[PDB]
Amino acid sequence: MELSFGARAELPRIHPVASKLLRLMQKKETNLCLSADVSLARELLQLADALGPSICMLKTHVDILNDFTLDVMKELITLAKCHEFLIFEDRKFADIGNTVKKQYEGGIFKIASWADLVNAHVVPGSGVVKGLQEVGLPLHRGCLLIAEMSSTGSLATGDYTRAAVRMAEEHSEFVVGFISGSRVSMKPEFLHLTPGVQLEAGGDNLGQQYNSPQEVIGKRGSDIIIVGRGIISAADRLEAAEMYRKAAWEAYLSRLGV
Amino acid sequence: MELSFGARAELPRIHPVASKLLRLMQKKETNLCLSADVSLARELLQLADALGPSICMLKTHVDILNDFTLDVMKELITLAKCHEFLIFEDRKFADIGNTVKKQYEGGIFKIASWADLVNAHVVPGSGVVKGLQEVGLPLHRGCLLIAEMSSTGSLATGDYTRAAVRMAEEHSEFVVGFISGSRVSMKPEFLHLTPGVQLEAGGDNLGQQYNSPQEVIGKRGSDIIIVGRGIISAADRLEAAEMYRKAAWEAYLSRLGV
Numbered sequence: 250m251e252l253s254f255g256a257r258a259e260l261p262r263i264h265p266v267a268s269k270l271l272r273l274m275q276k277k278e279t280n281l282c283l284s285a286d287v288s289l290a291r292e293l294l295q296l297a298d299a300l301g302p303s304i305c306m307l308k309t310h311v312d313i314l315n316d317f318t319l320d321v322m323k324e325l326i327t328l329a330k331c332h333e334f335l336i337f338e339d340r341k342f343a344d345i346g347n348t349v350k351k352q353y354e355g356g357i358f359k360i361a362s363w364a365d366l367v368n369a370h371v372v373p374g375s376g377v378v379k380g381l382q383e384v385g386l387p388l389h390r391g392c393l394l395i396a397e398m399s400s401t402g403s404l405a406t407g408d409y410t411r412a413a414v415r416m417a418e419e420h421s422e423f424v425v426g427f428i429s430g431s432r433v434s435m436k437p438e439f440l441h442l443t444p445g446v447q448l449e450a451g452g453d454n455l456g457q458q459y460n461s462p463q464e465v466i467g468k469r470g471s472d473i474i475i476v477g478r479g480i481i482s483a484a485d486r487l488e489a490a491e492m493y494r495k496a497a498w499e500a501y502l503s504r505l506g507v
Numbered sequence: 508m509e510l511s512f513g514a515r516a517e518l519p520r521i522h523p524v525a526s527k528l529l530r531l532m533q534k535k536e537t538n539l540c541l542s543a544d545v546s547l548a549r550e551l552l553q554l555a556d557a558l559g560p561s562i563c564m565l566k567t568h569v570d571i572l573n574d575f576t577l578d579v580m581k582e583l584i585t586l587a588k589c590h591e592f593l594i595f596e597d598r599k600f601a602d603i604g605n606t607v608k609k610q611y612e613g614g615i616f617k618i619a620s621w622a623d624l625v626n627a628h629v630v631p632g633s634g635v636v637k638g639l640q641e642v643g644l645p646l647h648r649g650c651l652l653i654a655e656m657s658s659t660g661s662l663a664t665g666d667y668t669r670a671a672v673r674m675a676e677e678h679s680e681f682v683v684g685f686i687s688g689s690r691v692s693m694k695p696e697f698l699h700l701t702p703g704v705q706l707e708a709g710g711d712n713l714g715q716q717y718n719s720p721q722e723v724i725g726k727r728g729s730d731i732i733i734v735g736r737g738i739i740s741a742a743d744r745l746e747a748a749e750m751y752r753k754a755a756w757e758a759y760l761s762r763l764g765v
């Protein structure tokens with residue numbers, strides 16, 4: 250009784266950020282999140298503009314931008330609104346609740362002011378979510394919990410993954426889904442986003458491991474692929490994005506069936 | 508066969524950053540790390556200057572500083588050299604290795620350029636350490652692994668804690684110790700630093716839990732207390748720091764014995 254992305258966007262318990270995302274995924278036929286792993290604002294913005302029509306989401310690491318300013322993020326928002334994608338800051342909050350609220354709202358990045366989505370590790374216990382929520386709920390934001398990781402030796406397995414799912418369930422006013430390698434929740438209101446994705450097999454020399462879009466969307470039941478170097482290191486990043494979009498979208502259609 | 512801090516500073520396998528720290532702890536009779544949880548550079552620097560003689564270490568969250576610049580960190584280094592304490596950026600790196608190297612070296616914070624110590628979560632697997640090391644080893648830096656957390660519902664327990672200890676052992680050219688609630692390694696070359704510390708019992712409303720200096724240094728076998736609000740929220744932060752220093756130092760002396 251699997252529902253399409255467009256039908257999931259209407260579920261009773263859906264979070265508004267998840268609903269907006271699912272609707273634009275269905276409209277644009279994309280379940281691709283670009284991992285915009287660059288150090289220059291101009292490259293970030295040029296990628297966002299050119300690849301915007303192909304993506305449901307643009308994932309940032311603003312702490313790697315050599316020339317970050319809040320104005321850069323204003324320009325990114327303009328492109329996100331134009332092309333219809335969400336902005337996900339991959340900050341991996343992982344501190345006690347009292348600290349993460351300040352890291353989310355404040356400092357020089359003011360993440361909550363521009364990021365539709367952030368993510369958090371569950372290792373501190375649920376205070377990490379409660380602290381983020383204090384800022385994010387009033388700002389109508391969402392959060393993803395890291396239930397599994399793609400890297401070699403990941404400890405986000407077994408009972409740890411189960412704890413992440415329970416923590417998400419219990420904080421569904423703010424938590425909209427997971428970073429995971431597969432479907433980890435049976436509740437269709439939750440989004441599953443999967444990094445560690447390339448068309449070709451392999452990994453990197455610092456523990457990254459790859460699986461294909463067909464494997465992670467089609468066989469492992471995830472919703473969205475997060476793709477960095479598979480796109481960013483290609484010469485033509487637009488064509489690369491289209492190849493990843495088509496791969497992830499078809500895998501979704503095939504799983505959904507008749 | 509427990510050794511004093513000064514003798515531990517001479518151990519064959521000691522890391523140079525750990526040795527420098529242990530020597531100044533012994534010289535100054537302090538095993539207190541100030542958690543300088545403030546949002547203003549002027550308050551950070553005024554605390555560092557006044558409390559510098561009382562502390563072995565100043566722990567930052569630079570991503571909470573509303574007015575961060577690299578010049579602020581230059582001024583902090585001047586105070587660290589004058590008063591003899593190390594600078595620990597509590598960044599809690601927790602990404603794949605290829606990402607954390609960039610977050611450590613680059614962006615607007617350039618953490619590796621000014622932080623003697625950083626810390627990392629072990630959940631991604633050992634690639635997190637390998638990525639940080641790429642930057643930190645050439646810069647003669649050290650790292651602490653988060654083996655336990657003080658917050659309610661922490662998942663850093665059992666086999667997770669054991670994995671952190673093994674990861675530290677296997678990366679001893681860069682990893683100098685742990686964030687933990689207790690002694691987790693029997694190897695005296697590793698430092699144990701413990702947050703969640705106040706003189707009075709209790710916690711906060713976002714999952715923080717407190718234990719006293721006597722409990723964590725004396726009964727749980729840790730080396731250094733990390734103290735935030737117990738000092739920062741007091742009216743006289745210098746006297747508060749002295750109370751925490753005396754508590755932690757005596758607990759250490761009593762454990763060390765004859």
Ligand code: PRO
Pocket residue numbers: 448449450460461
């Ligand atoms: O692992 C494999 O064999 C296939 C080849 C392309 C990606 N997956």
Ligand code: PRO
Pocket residue numbers: 447449450451452453459
């Ligand atoms: O494994 C490798 O090294 C290459 C790059 C990623 C996909 N295959």
Ligand code: PRO
Pocket residue numbers: 253505506507
């Ligand atoms: O046809 C239908 O109604 C469902 C949803 C799209 C594919 N199968």
Ligand code: PRO
Pocket residue numbers: 706707708718719
């Ligand atoms: O928990 C207790 O009872 C004591 C009181 C001060 C701190 N520890």
Ligand code: PRO
Pocket residue numbers: 705707708709710711717
């Ligand atoms: O538990 C409380 O709320 C106070 C503040 C920390 C120590 N006792």
Ligand code: PRO
Pocket residue numbers: 511763764765
């Ligand atoms: O007296 C000694 O030699 C040891 C080290 C200081 C305390 N006991």
